[PDB]
Amino acid sequence: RFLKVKNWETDVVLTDTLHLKSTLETGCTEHICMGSIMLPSVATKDQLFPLAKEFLDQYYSSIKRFGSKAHMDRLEEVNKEIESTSTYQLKDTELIYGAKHAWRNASRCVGRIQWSKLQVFDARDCTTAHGMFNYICNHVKYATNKGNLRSAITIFPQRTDGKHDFRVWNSQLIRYAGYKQPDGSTLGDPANVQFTEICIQQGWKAPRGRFDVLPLLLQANGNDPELFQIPPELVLEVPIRHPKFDWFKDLGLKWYGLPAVSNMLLEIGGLEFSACPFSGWYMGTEIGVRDYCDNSRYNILEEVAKKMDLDMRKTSSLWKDQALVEINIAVLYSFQSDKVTIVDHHSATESFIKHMENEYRCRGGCPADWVWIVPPMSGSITPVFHQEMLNYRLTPSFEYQPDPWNTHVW
Amino acid sequence: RFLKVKNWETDVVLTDTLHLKSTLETGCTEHICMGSIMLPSVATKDQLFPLAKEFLDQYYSSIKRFGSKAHMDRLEEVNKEIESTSTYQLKDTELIYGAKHAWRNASRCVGRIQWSKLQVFDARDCTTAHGMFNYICNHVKYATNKGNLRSAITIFPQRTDGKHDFRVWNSQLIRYAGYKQPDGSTLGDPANVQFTEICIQQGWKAPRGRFDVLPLLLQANGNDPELFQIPPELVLEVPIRHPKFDWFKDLGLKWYGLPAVSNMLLEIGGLEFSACPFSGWYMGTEIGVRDYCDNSRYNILEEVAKKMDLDMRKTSSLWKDQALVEINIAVLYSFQSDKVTIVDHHSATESFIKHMENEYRCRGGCPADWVWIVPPMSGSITPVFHQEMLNYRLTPSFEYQPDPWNTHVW
Numbered sequence A, B: 001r002f003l004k005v006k007n008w009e010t011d012v013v014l015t016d017t018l019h020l021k022s023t024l025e026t027g028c029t030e031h032i033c034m035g036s037i038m039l040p041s042v043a044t045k046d047q048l049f050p051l052a053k054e055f056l057d058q059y060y061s062s063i064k065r066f067g068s069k070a071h072m073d074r075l076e077e078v079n080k081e082i083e084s085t086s087t088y089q090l091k092d093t094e095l096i097y098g099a100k101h102a103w104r105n106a107s108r109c110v111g112r113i114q115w116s117k118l119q120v121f122d123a124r125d126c127t128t129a130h131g132m133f134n135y136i137c138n139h140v141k142y143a144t145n146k147g148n149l150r151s152a153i154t155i156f157p158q159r160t161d162g163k164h165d166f167r168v169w170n171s172q173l174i175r176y177a178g179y180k181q182p183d184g185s186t187l188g189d190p191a192n193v194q195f196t197e198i199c200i201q202q203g204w205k206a207p208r209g210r211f212d213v214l215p216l217l218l219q220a221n222g223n224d225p226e227l228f229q230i231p232p233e234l235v236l237e238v239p240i241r242h243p244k245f246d247w248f249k250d251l252g253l254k255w256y257g258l259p260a261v262s263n264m265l266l267e268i269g270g271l272e273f274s275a276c277p278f279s280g281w282y283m284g285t286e287i288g289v290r291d292y293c294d295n296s297r298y299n300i301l302e303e304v305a306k307k308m309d310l311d312m313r314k315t316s317s318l319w320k321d322q323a324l325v326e327i328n329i330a331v332l333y334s335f336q337s338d339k340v341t342i343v344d345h346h347s348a349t350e351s352f353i354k355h356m357e358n359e360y361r362c363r364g365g366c367p368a369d370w371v372w373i374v375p376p377m378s379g380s381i382t383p384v385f386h387q388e389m390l391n392y393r394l395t396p397s398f399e400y401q402p403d404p405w406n407t408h409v410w
């Protein structure tokens, strides 16, 4: 009931009591661990007030006013508001608190040392896709900050009956298109080929190239979604060069500076925000390892190893590993030389350990998903590899949700 | 009750029903996943026959004679033998079956495609530490096979009352010593500094250098353990050179060819074999990444990056990643050029996926520990990174056990 986590590189032991406040379930049981399963698995008023009370208790605790009169009146105000409408509305303060803590609770996020430096854009007054576009543009502009990236979240109206959901159909605000070729191969990003076609179906005119920034597909109040093109001046892009290899330019790679997830669901006090695009900055490996080198993504290890003139006959020459490291030095160098915020996996993972120590100290724990926290290369030469982590579900939280096209009464 | 695991690089889905035969518990609950905890947590006759029956049922099932007369008579023979002595003895056939399946069930072992090619040395007639030494030497000689390594396990008498355990006090049959220096630094292997001292306490005369192969500390029938020096001619060693960098020789690194774990407990049919050294061959990264580059092991990344003349000022130059890849090419090249069996993490992890497909097909599943199966470098450019795995505990099994010195009535 007071669980211990050890770091096997420092012999440091932290004690977790925060997992006692855990509410949702993990997918694991006493007899099966599902910690490597990628995805593990309308509301009513009878369930809502417990969720609202729990959240309001932690909100008022966090401002040194747990159990005060203002707390009780808010509790009663929300209870009575749930009585009337079978839902309720968060204060601006509660909304900002909840969003920050959904990030704080994201066990898969190695970047949480920054969790309290989060800029919350309240878009709950939005009514139309055009409003969404506007709000999203201002998010991109603010978050990008001329390369001095700033963490931000934009929060559209909460789910009501379910058939009036706000949704951003893009998986990220900024992603590159993906088209299948006549010869079956893929140009651009294979991950987005279905979404790229959905935009063509709703009317996108595609410049069938590699790094074509997709338009936005914005659904407002459950209506059919609508296409919008982010102004190109708002899309900061980094050309990828290597500090040593000059042919690396000829590779002609570029990536966007702003990672901004837009397909997740923000849960606060039992309220569901189905459209809550949030952005930070990149860890290098997301681009250099996963985006560029996943076999189902840009899959460039072939080309880079060629230009390096590596022994590609044998798997055991580690030509793949050697090219992988060169690519990630190139992503980092290119972003830093452009003053565009980025963090290498060593800096990021060290900060997460430090963040973990803070959370165990001032909060009694830190939910953490080792499978996701350990970078996709150089695992054990980063300190998180050696860090036991307890994974558990705390709320407020970011949740996955079905893709909108699979569910939307169209 | 019929769980699905997906590979997110191939879109391949396998169905696991084998987890239903799972017996022991994982450490995880519905509310907390402990999949990154490194260690998760005398017998009686009233518990033994269930364990014996379960095992004998699976043994006789596996030879197409489940429920036959020979099965029932063995079941009755073992029941009556447990009645008399409150324990029982395995047939040679059952012992070999159990050991192979303890390996087959080792969810942390990426090497299980080989699980049925296991050479079982029955040492249950051993009575003394000298017998153990002899048996262990023959294991080393056979397994090493002039570099054409062969998987083997040597199985000493099962635990009886508990105070007559056979134990190999070494964590591996072959490991390098570790001594702390006058200036506090460590020479050799920091992992073994406590064990190295224990040998000095029991009488080892140490050649205080780096790669000094430790003696054996063998405990027989619960008596005090005794030191033995493996004949050096039996300890195959590989000098580490690089196919490109000639200074890599000046690094003066060498490792032993035979990885042979000796501190684990083999559980078969509820019987406990506390001394069961088993050996295979190395995956390159065990040496090149963990042994050489863990900060708490040989910690050589410093030196290698120096000789490579790498930018070590910035963490973000990835000098560590770049030196790490060079080291692992050197370990692989050096072993292969010496015809000493080794497998690179690409070959090994590909074979494990293939092994997984076999087990789901012909067995309904394959227990697998993603945290341990994914190599410590180049994670996502190997196929296991993308492979959902269910972890669960099947028996026969290899279990951790306390270090003998912490428990032994001395």
Ligand code: HEM
Residues within 6 Å of the ligand: A099, A102, A103, A106, A108, A109, A110, A111, A112, A114, A118, A151, A152, A153, A278, A279, A280, A281, A282, A283, A286, A343, A348, A372, A398
């Ligand atoms: C500020 C810099 C940030 C960094 C360096 C960072 C880093 C990361 C990385 C590398 C991942 C793994 C993503 C993947 O592999 O696909 C991740 C996951 C995640 N991040 Fe962060 N992040 C940052 C900011 C944020 C912010 C501002 C939020 C929310 C407000 C957030 C919420 C999450 C969530 C919910 C996940 C889990 C995604 C999933 O399960 O698919 N992060 N983070």
Ligand code: HEM
Residues within 6 Å of the ligand: B099, B102, B103, B106, B108, B109, B110, B111, B112, B114, B118, B151, B152, B153, B278, B279, B280, B281, B282, B283, B286, B343, B348, B372, B398
């Ligand atoms: C034949 C070649 C083999 C290869 C390439 C291989 C590979 C590996 C590797 C890389 C690990 C992780 C070890 C670590 O990181 O410390 C491991 C773990 C393990 N292996 Fe294998 N192995 C082989 C043979 C065997 C054999 C013959 C057995 C038993 C008869 C075995 C049983 C185990 C067990 C029980 C573990 C888990 C150890 C733990 O939890 O600490 N392996 N294997």
Ligand SMILES: N=C(Nc1cccc(CNCCc2ccc(-c3ccccc3)cc2CN)c1)c1cccs1
Residues within 6 Å of the ligand: A259, A260, A261, A278, A279, A280, A281, A282, A283, A286, B008
């Ligand atoms: N720095 C960042 N990064 C980051 C953070 C959170 C989440 C993500 C993206 N998380 C997506 C992982 C994912 C999800 C689904 C599928 C998938 C779904 C259906 C079919 C096939 C694949 C594949 C992947 C990645 N392979 C990136 C930030 C972006 C915004 C703030 S921080």
Ligand SMILES: N=C(Nc1cccc(CNCCc2ccc(-c3ccccc3)cc2CN)c1)c1cccs1
Residues within 6 Å of the ligand: A008, B259, B260, B261, B278, B279, B280, B281, B282, B283, B286
């Ligand atoms: N190819 C091989 N390899 C392999 C396979 C199985 C197990 C192992 C060694 N598994 C040890 C992992 C471990 C355990 C304990 C501690 C530890 C304990 C107390 C204090 C500090 C550390 C540290 C580590 C590694 N960091 C290697 C083979 C050897 C034999 C057959 S196959």
Ligand SMILES: C[C@H](O)[C@H](O)[C@H]1CNc2nc(N)[nH]c(=O)c2N1
Residues within 6 Å of the ligand: A035, A036, A037, A038, A371, A372, A373, B008, B385, B386, B387, B388, B389
């Ligand atoms: C099967 C496995 O869960 C899947 O590949 C996970 C592994 N860890 C990951 N970790 C991060 N950060 N991002 C990912 O997409 C994944 N993928």
Ligand SMILES: C[C@H](O)[C@H](O)[C@H]1CNc2nc(N)[nH]c(=O)c2N1
Residues within 6 Å of the ligand: A008, A385, A386, A387, A388, A389, B035, B036, B037, B038, B371, B372, B373
């Ligand atoms: C904390 C964490 O569980 C620990 O570092 C694990 C991670 N995965 C591992 N995987 C292997 N193969 N060997 C290890 O020693 C470890 N260490």
Ligand SMILES: [Zn+2]
Residues within 6 Å of the ligand: A028, A032, A033, A034, A035, B028, B032, B033, B034, B035
């Ligand atoms: Zn688990």
